[PDB]
Structure 1
Amino acid sequence: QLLQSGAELVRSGASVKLSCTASGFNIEMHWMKQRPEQGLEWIGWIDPVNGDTEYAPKFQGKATMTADTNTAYLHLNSLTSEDTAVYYCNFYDGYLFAFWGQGTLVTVSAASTKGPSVFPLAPSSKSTSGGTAALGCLVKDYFPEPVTVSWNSGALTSGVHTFPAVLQSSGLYSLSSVVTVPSSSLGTQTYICNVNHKPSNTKVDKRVEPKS
């Protein structure tokens, strides 16, 4: 099981170094790049013990891979908007035990980081469906991607829809996270969305309540 420390915002022409830590093994690694709404692309291969590093045709002058023995490192340079993408490190053992990291988003923009505002999408029950009632959180006006929403600190997951973020004409992002819930349970039980925007060091716990 391997995690990679991501969420990078850099200006067109800068350079980044992404980490990739390992919590089980370290032999055999591979890097890949996924444009935000596109197929996968292969970066390259690194031998943990000996820096024997093949690279793709377009990442030759861009990508550089290292390892410290228990992490891997990928350094990119001369980043344009076409490098804004998710970066995965995977260590396949040749047989049937391929592992992958959760990915690292690299946004290439001049825009400033902005923390999100978190507003309730309050249910009514009186003015809602009969069986279930929907409530939610609006996470508005943040940059860069991504934000993460949980409900009741990960305890509530059934019938949660966290939507994809949309980029507004203002150049800022905004997503909604809704959850449906039996209307009987309202008022008695507590519903709280946990918004986390790492690039701006913003964590918000917003208690969503019926309108009073």
Structure 2
Amino acid sequence: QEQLKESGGRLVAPGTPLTLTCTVSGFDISDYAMIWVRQAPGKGLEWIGIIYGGSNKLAYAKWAKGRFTISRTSTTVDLKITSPTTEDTATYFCARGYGSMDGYDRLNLWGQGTLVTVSSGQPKGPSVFPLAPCCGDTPSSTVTLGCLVKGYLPEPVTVTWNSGTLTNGVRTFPSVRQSSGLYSLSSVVSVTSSSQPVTCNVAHPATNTKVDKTVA
């Protein structure tokens, strides 16, 4: 099984250098080429650079102008962002191409990506608030509950329900960044009124925050 996995995305202040790593498994980097790409929130995909596993060939996008350095080890390829600016906030993906020497094609293997955030703010774990409806006179056999996950930095957080055992129809909305620099999102779930209570489990790896909120 051929796989790629990127790591090292984290929060940095502008100007603070950052190195991302793509770890390969099930094939040899020397037989292929490896390409870095990113996507800033709201913007499109953007090709950054390429390293050929078989040669001394390596190129950066014309616009890079020394903004990035790419290198390898025996099982990884790396991307260093030499002096990050807020514009480099993005998810970075690693991709394998065919053609080890000079000439590449067919980018058919991709990692899940790693998330880089460039900001002058300090990391901050989320506050978690239960969302329950006001409730009317005609009782329902079903109810929709939720959790508001507010004021965290950097993305991402994960939200589960009842430790993963409640998933049917869950809606977790895309995060939005407030003018504070912090992010918020909500997640809601519908369940029979008889099955309550229901607990949202929120985790924020960047601060190793884990919070459960039982919604009443």
Fold shared, TM-score > 0.5 on shorter chain: yes
Note if 1:68 corresponds to 2:70. no
Match of 1:37 in 2: 42
Contact 1:117–1:139 (8 Å) recurs in 2: yes
Match of 1:20 in 2: 22
Q: CA deviation at 1:97?
A: 7.6
SS at match of 1:153: helix
Q: What does residue range 35-184 of structure 1 map to in structure 2 within 5 Å?
A: 35-93=40-98, 98-122=108-132, 130-184=140-194
Q: Tell me, in whole angstroms, the C-alpha distance in 2 between the residues paired with 1:55 and 1:96.
A: 18
Q: Tell me, in whole angstroms, the C-alpha distance in 1 between the residues paired with 2:98 and 2:139.
A: 52
Task: Give the direction of change, closer, same or farther, for the CA distance of 1:147–1:46 in structure 2 (3 Å limit).
Answer: same
Task: Give the direction of change, closer, same or farther, for the CA distance of 1:8–1:88 in structure 2 (3 Å limit).
Answer: same
Contact 1:63–1:75 (8 Å) recurs in 2: yes
Contact 2:38–2:92 (8 Å) recurs in 1: yes
Tell me the percent identity: 55
Contact 2:8–2:19 (8 Å) recurs in 1: no
Contact 1:132–1:180 (8 Å) recurs in 2: yes
CA deviation map 1:40-68 (0-9, x unaligned): 01011112354421110122411111221
CA deviation map 1:121-145 (0-9, x unaligned): 2467777873531112111111122
Q: How many residues align?
A: 206
Match of 1:206 in 2: 213
Higher deviation after alignment, 82-91 or 176-185: 176-185
What amino acid sits opposite 2:27 in the alignment? Answer: F
Q: Tell me, in whole angstroms, the C-alpha distance in 2 between the residues paired with 1:3 and 1:185.
A: 39
What amino acid sits opposite 1:196 in the alignment? Answer: A
CA deviation map 1:59-81 (0-9, x unaligned): 24111112212222110112111
Contact 1:149–1:195 (8 Å) recurs in 2: yes
* Structure 1 unaligned spans of 5+: none
* Structure 2 unaligned spans of 5+: 100-104
Q: Tell me, in whole angstroms, the C-alpha distance in 2 between the residues paired with 1:129 and 1:97.
A: 54
Task: Give the direction of change, closer, same or farther, for the CA distance of 1:128–1:174 in structure 2 (3 Å limit).
Answer: farther
SS at match of 1:4: strand
Q: Tell me, in whole angstroms, the C-alpha distance in 2 between the residues paired with 1:93 and 1:127.
A: 65
Q: CA deviation at 1:34?
A: 0.8
Contact 1:34–1:86 (8 Å) recurs in 2: yes
